[PDB]
Amino acid sequence: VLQRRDWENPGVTQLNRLAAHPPFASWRNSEEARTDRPSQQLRSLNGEWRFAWFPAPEAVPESWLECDLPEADTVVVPSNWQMHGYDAPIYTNVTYPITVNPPFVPTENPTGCYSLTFNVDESWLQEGQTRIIFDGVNSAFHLWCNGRWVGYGQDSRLPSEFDLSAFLRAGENRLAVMVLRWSDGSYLEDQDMWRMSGIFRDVSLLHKPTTQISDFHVATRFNDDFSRAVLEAEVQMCGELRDYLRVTVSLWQGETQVASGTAPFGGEIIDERGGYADRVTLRLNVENPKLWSAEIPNLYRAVVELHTADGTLIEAEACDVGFREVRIENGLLLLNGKPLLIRGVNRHEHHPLHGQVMDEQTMVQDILLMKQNNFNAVRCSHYPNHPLWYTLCDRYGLYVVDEANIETHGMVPMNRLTDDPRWLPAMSERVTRMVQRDRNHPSVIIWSLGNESGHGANHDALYRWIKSVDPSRPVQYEGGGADTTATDIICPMYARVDEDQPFPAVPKWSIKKWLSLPGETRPLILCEYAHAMGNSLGGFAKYWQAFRQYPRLQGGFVWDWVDQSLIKYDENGNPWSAYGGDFGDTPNDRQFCMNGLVFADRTPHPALTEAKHQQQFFQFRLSGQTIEVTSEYLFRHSDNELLHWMVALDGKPLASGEVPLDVAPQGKQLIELPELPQPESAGQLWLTVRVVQPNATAWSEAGHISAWQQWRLAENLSVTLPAASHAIPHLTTSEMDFCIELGNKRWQFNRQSGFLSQMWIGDKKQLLTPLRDQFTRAPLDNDIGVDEATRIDPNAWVERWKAAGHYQAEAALLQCTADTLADAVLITTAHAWQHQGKTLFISRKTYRIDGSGQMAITVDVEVASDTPHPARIGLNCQLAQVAERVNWLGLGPQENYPDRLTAACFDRWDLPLSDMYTPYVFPSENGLRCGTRELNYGPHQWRGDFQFNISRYSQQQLMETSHRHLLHAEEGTWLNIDGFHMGIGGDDSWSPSVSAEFQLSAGRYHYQLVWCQK
Amino acid sequence: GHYQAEAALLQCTADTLADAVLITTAHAWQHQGKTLFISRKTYRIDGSGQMAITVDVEVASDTPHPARIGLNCQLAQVAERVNWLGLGPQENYPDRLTAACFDRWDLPLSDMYTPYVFPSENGLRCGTRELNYGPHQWRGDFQFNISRYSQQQLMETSHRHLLHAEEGTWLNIDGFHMGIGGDDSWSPSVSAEFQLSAGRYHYQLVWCQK
Lengths: 1014, 210
Ligand SMILES: CC(C)S[C@@H]1O[C@H](CO)[C@H](O)[C@H](O)[C@H]1O
Ligand SMILES: [Mg+2]
Ligand SMILES: [Mg+2]
Ligand code: NA
Ligand code: NA
Ligand code: NA
Known about the structure:
The structure is cut from a larger assembly and holds two copies of chain A. Chain A is mainly β.
């Protein structure tokens, strides 16, 4: 064992490991099997185990096999030992966490010694077979039972199983598991995620009779219109063949048996040597079957009884059966005859506390959120999941892409292993043992060959293996250019909608162009798109406009579901979110582990609502009085949906109402609105419709909003002049300052800087920092890309801004004059922002303070055409006032940006100040709200047509601080008011991704604001 | 009512600045009680004899997007040459300007008119920073056409040969101009990005004699 070094041999991926197979419970009562109640023959060995850590496997003492070590501790299993503090988790993306020297791993290979003293019931050893199942061990392990070696296993994401029947004694028993952190297996586990290890999934003991169901496959085929099905169940036995032996496969819907078949063993003749005498295929006819889909996850129950002809049950197995067809026809992925539109998301198995250990609660939590936010599909990025995941997806209704635990991203070139026949054995085990495990789950609709491992001949062989073994499911794979011969689906990652990215060998064509390349017929579903890293998902709507226009663009899987942040603690025992490099870990890829639509604790990022809106299942058109509602549901009718409409003038409700939605799948409903009441005052009428689900479901609460849309109706422009003012403001001129006085209000303009330096209400200052122009933002993740202090990327927006000096450019005053008028004082200014002799921006302003006490600020900016386009064109100032609430008439309520505002609605919004800050773990520009016409904060009111954000953090603190928890609330409130703001992008987070139409490139910019106290 | 919309004055004040005079105005174009467009303007005339016109326009969102947001007038002058710094030499519109080049152009006044057999808007040149005609110079960032033919005469005349040179020179200077379309000629074919849909529009001119 010490001598062999099997963890450094891709030829040895297991020793004495049993065959893979679908979930077994070995029920000895049919009814228990039918109802899926716990099985006395399936014991869990989860809980308190004994664990010790070692620098290498050589440093594991001989005594540990026979005796528990005193140094060892009592830990909970399943667990990742990094999460218990024993060593550091490593976050790396591409570059391997170990030296690239296949198949060799580091001599210093962290070794986790697990042990358990447990009882085996006598009954279990008198008859039948007792096996141990390790659902997840990262990354390789040797197993001993009662001091005797049992076997070895690799592949972190599939169960390893061993027969312990001859190793177990009655009474107390002891398992010894030596878990290696790195193995030849590691070379195929280079996923972009936290690198951890240990026994991290369930450990259990299964008892099976000596004569047993060893394997079983369920299949369902249909007639042309799905009105008749045939369930086909292949069952294989182990043990002695006997004439009295039978299998009954019976199909239940609730408590009704709908079909049943019983046959002896011995299948049809297969070749010249006969057939499988140890197998039987059962064929059941089902009339008018209830079809399975994510829309309506109709399940049947299938119970497979192994028994004597005379009626003695030997054992029962079972699975949920979902009657559905998955085929690709004429270039379209069809489910039950209908073209799918995949509203998907990639989801790693991550928990901020427990690491890579999963639990029902978290999984259920994830499914509900996904379904509540209009997702219908998930990708198992990039390994087979905890077995409960599929059960839940079967039951709640989600399309799953099941992915082999193969990623060799770090290799050079990416297919160095996958094109090497010597790695085919290791690879095949990762594909084949997956298929054997999950093939009966209806929620799995697509098989994937892994992730980011180039395209090698090994992929082609495995592709064909699956197509041969399971015709029911298309096979996809992205490596080597996303459209190789190893994929039934064009599945690129981060291909853009309109923009070609013609990388050599592996181009990412615009998805619209990709479909029509000469000879191409396949459907396109993006395996990864819209990289939700930090403040992101800009341009998301553009994907969905395309998905809907093009039949063969059948959607994609967002990257990704949840931030991979871990929980650390400070001096005071206060929790904070940690990313790459926060564990002494190096080389690291810092915050690249947080691309989630939700935080590690499952709190939504702002972007989640944008996804929810774009992935709506009802589309709307307006034509005068008529709302046309179109259903994008393929199967269900809108039987738990009513339309809630509201007409509002500038946030003020006028008319409302409800209509029940009665829409057939893919059908249309015309809702005729009543004659609307005439709005008195001036303003813009907005119509808002919402789709509300009256009844609670398995996945949502009563009143859950599933879709919404807005339209501008009538606008009555204000023509009424404000009534003339008695008072006239007084200019108090100085060498250094222009003061303007009216009532208790006082305005000061510094004649050396050119900016409003101060305002007074009564005799209290309102500003801590003068009102100045701003052309920069605290850079987003998308602004940064793969840019770091040691490796400069000159093309990332932040570097373009930096090199051009946007951040360090000083305002030179060109002009600052004062004029008194009939009813107003007029301050005129001009500033030039220069860096090293170049003039980047000229800002020409006028400040018109009149008798009403309302300062009308007019701003016109020239931006030099050869300077990189600025992040924003606006003003900032630090206010002295700190209010509890922020109130505005604009897009909201949540954070929105120019290329991410479709989900925001125009209305009157009122939130606490803290909600106006988005706590991105890597702090940046955040909290912006667009199309705002009025902003209120304490005694202040601004009016116009602007974008804004308001917080206790400066753009300077946001860009100088690496983690959210290190931010300190500054004195007063920083306000950012922008006439214009650059898009956030996020088609990926490693190249500039902001589309041309969201870049501030017009050259000349104009916006006007009205500042008044109310 | 875009074609019979009457201008209704809302504000018209003057102020003497330190070194200039400022004329602030506000207009509403109305039809059947509906305000279509509001035009807010400042005219600033300083010692150099330069008239800086600042125009801010509101367009009601529920009115069809207008053909142009600009200014016009009939000049008494009739010159032989038109000289401009902008896209040219030929007629160009926002959705048909890729062939035009930015440069100093000098054409006879006739060339600034396109003789389409059925008369319409014509002769426009876009992205113009300076226009010279006789004594006059206009500066900013605008589009313009310049001819002996008013919009009114063009739209009322069926054939080009029935056209008569009016007295003086009709000038149209647009801050913004709607696309011309053409994907077909039997349904709206002007793309969204070339429709004047923003709701609020700003442009600025400088007028002076040279
Ligand atoms: C950084 C790119 C060169 S690779 C890029 O990294 C991303 C980071 O979240 C994801 O892991 C993507 O799958 C991968 O293509
Ligand atoms: Mg090995
Ligand atoms: Mg990768
Ligand atoms: Na489609
Ligand atoms: Na990542
Ligand atoms: Na930062």
